[PDB]
Design a binder for this molecule. Structure first.
Ligand code: HEM
Length: 456
C-alpha cells in the first residue's frame, strides 16, 4: 500500500496552476511523463486520479469494479442531450433500453444498410474538391466536419443539412455547435450567476429550443407518414427492447438523435483530419495507402465489400487514433472500495480518468519509438495486448458508433487517396485544439485531381 504520486500543490489552488492552458489534455500528458502511470490531481473542490499505463488501465476496465462516471462536461451537455446513450448513467432504465435496442443497428452488418448514404455524402466532398480552382486550398477539419455532420443526419434521420451548399451552416448546426461551446465554457466560469451571463443563458435556451423543435418535427413527420427508411430513426420507431418488450418513447428518440450528432460529428472529423495530417507528413506512408486505394477501388463508386478490403487504410486510421485519439479521455468511478494495482486504495465513488493519448504511448507495449507514425503497428490487431488501445472507450459503455465511424472514415479516406494527390503547401505546424475533442486547427492542404471519373 503506497501513497499516490501527485504533482506539486500550491496552497489553496492545489494543482490548478499547472493547468493554466486551453490544452489541458496535452498538459496532463506532460505531468504523466514526469510522474508515471498514475497520479492524483486536485483543484479547489475536486479530486481525480489519472491513469496512463496499460497495466492499470486493464484494471480500471473491469466493469464489476468500475463504471462510467459523467464528467462535469457531460453533465452540462445533458441539458440538451438528455438521457441519450452518451449522457446517461449506466443504472438509468433508458440507458439500458436504448442500448439493447440500438446495438443491432450499429453492428458491422448494419453498415451494409448505411453504405449508400455514406457514399452519397462522400461523393459530394470529392466533387467539391474536384471543382476547386488552381489558386484555392482545402480547410481540412472544416470540410471533414461538413461531411460527418451530413452523413449522421442522413443515416441517422434521413435529413439533409446540405452543408456543402453553404458558407454558414444550417441553423440546427449553428445552435448545436453554440450549445456545445456554452456547455464547455461553463466549465471555467468563476461567477456563473453574474449578470454578464444572462445573454449566454438566454441563447442557450434558444439553441436548445431550435434543436428540439427540428428533431421533434422530423419524428412527428415520420410517425404520421409511416415511411420506412434505411435510417436509425426507422429502427428506433420499430424497435422493442428484448428484455422488457418496450419501445423508446418519442422524447428519448429525440435525445438519441441529438446524441448521435454530438457524439459522432467532431470525433469522426478529427480522425479524418489527423489521418490526412499524418499522411501528408509521411509521403512514403501516403504512397502505400494511395497504392492500396487504386488497387482496391476499381469501380466508379466504392462498394461495401471494397471498403472492407482497404486494410492499409484501416491501419492508417488506427495509427492516427493511437497518437491522437480524438475523444482523449473517459471518466470512471469506483463502484465499491477497492485496491488498484495492488498498491493504491480507492474508496467507493472515487473518480479515475483514463488519459488515452498517454496510454497509447506506453513504451512497454509499443516499443521505444511511440511518437512515430507507423501504421504497420496494426498489421496484426489480434496480437495487440488487451486494453492497450482504447480510442472508443470501454466495455458496455464503449463507443456504440465505432463500426459506423470506421466504415465512414475508411470509405472517405480511401476515396480521397484514389482521386487526389495532396500537398502540404504551408508546411503546416500541428496545433491541437481541445474542446471536448481533439482536432488539428488550421490544417490546410491543396489537392491536385488525378482526373478519375466518379459514378454512377
Ligand atoms: C472516430 C470517431 C469516434 C471516437 C474516437 C469515439 C469515441 C468514443 C468514446 C471514447 C466513447 C466513450 C465515452 C465515455 O466513456 O464517456 C464514446 C461513446 C459513444 N459514442 Fe463514440 N466515438 C466516435 C464516433 C462516434 C460516432 C460516429 C457515433 C454515432 C454515430 C458515436 C456515438 C457514441 C455514443 C452514442 C456513445 C455513448 C455509448 C454508450 O455509453 O452507450 N461515436 N465514443
Amino acid at each position: 500500500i503506497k501513497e499516490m504520486p501527485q504533482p506539486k500543490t500550491f496552497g489553496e489552488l492545489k494543482n490548478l496552476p499547472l493547468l493554466n492552458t486551453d490544452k489541458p489534455v496535452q498538459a496532463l500528458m506532460k505531468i504523466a511523463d514526469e510522474l508515471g502511470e498514475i497520479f492524483k490531481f486536485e483543484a479547489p473542490g475536486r479530486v481525480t486520479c489519472y491513469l496512463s499505463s496499460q497495466r492499470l488501465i486493464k484494471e480500471a476496465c473491469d466493469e464489476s469494479r468500475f463504471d462510467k462516471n459523467l464528467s462535469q462536461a457531460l453533465k452540462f451537455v445533458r441539458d440538451f442531450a438528455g438521457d441519450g446513450l452518451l449522457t446517461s448513467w449506466t443504472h438509468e432504465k433508458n440507458w439500458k433500453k436504448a442500448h439493447n435496442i440500438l446495438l443491432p443497428s450499429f453492428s458491422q452488418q448494419a453498415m451494409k444498410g448505411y453504405h449508400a448514404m455514406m457514399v452519397d455524402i462522400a461523393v459530394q466532398l470529392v466533387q467539391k474538391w474536384e471543382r476547386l480552382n488552381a489558386d484555392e486550398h482545402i480547410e481540412v477539419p472544416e470540410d471533414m466536419t461538413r461531411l460527418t455532420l451530413d452523413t449522421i443526419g442522413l443515416c441517422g434521420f434521413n435529413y439533409r443539412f446540405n452543408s456543402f451548399y453553404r458558407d454558414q451552416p444550417h441553423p440546427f448546426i449553428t445552435s448545436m455547435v453554440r450549445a456545445l461551446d456554452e456547455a464547455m465554457n461553463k466549465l471555467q466560469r468563476a461567477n456563473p450567476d453574474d449578470p454578464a451571463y444572462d445573454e449566454n443563458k438566454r441563447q442557450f435556451q434558444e439553441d436548445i429550443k431550435v434543436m428540439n423543435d427540428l428533431v421533434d418535427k422530423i419524428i412527428a413527420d415520420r410517425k404520421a407518414s409511416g415511411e420506412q427508411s434505411d435510417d436509425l430513426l426507422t429502427h428506433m420507431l420499430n424497435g422493442k427492447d428484448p428484455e422488457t418488450g418496450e419501445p423508446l418513447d418519442d422524447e428519448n428518440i429525440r435525445y438519441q438523435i441529438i446524441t448521435f450528432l454530438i457524439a459522432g460529428h467532431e470525433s469522426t472529423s478529427g480522425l479524418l483530419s489527423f489521418a490526412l495530417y499524418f499522411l501528408v507528413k509521411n509521403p512514403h506512408v501516403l504512397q502505400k495507402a494511395a497504392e492500396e486505394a487504386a488497387r482496391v477501388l476499381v469501380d466508379p463508386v466504392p462498394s461495401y465489400k471494397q471498403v472492407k478490403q482497404l486494410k492499409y487504410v484501416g491501419m492508417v486510421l488506427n495509427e492516427a487514433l493511437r497518437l491522437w485519439p480524438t475523444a482523449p479521455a473517459f471518466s470512471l468511478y469506483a463502484k465499491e472500495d477497492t485496491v488498484l494495482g495492488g498498491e493504491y486504495p480507492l474508496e467507493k465513488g472515487d473518480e479515475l480518468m483514463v488519459l488515452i493519448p498517454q496510454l497509447h504511448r506506453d513504451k512497454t507495449i509499443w516499443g521505444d519509438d511511440v511518437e512515430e507514425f507507423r501504421p504497420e503497428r496494426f498489421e496484426n490487431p489480434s496480437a495487440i495486448p488487451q486494453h492497450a488501445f482504447k480510442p472508443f472507450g470501454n466495455g458496455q459503455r464503449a463507443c456504440i458508433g465505432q463500426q459506423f465511424a470506421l466504415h465512414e472514415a475508411t470509405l472517405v479516406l480511401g476515396m480521397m487517396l484514389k482521386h487526389f494527390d495532396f500537398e502540404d503547401h504551408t508546411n503546416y505546424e500541428l496545433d491541437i485544439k481541445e474542446t471536448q475533442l481533439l482536432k488539428p486547427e488550421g490544417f490546410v492542404v491543396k489537392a491536385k485531381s488525378k482526373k478519375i471519373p466518379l459514378g454512377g
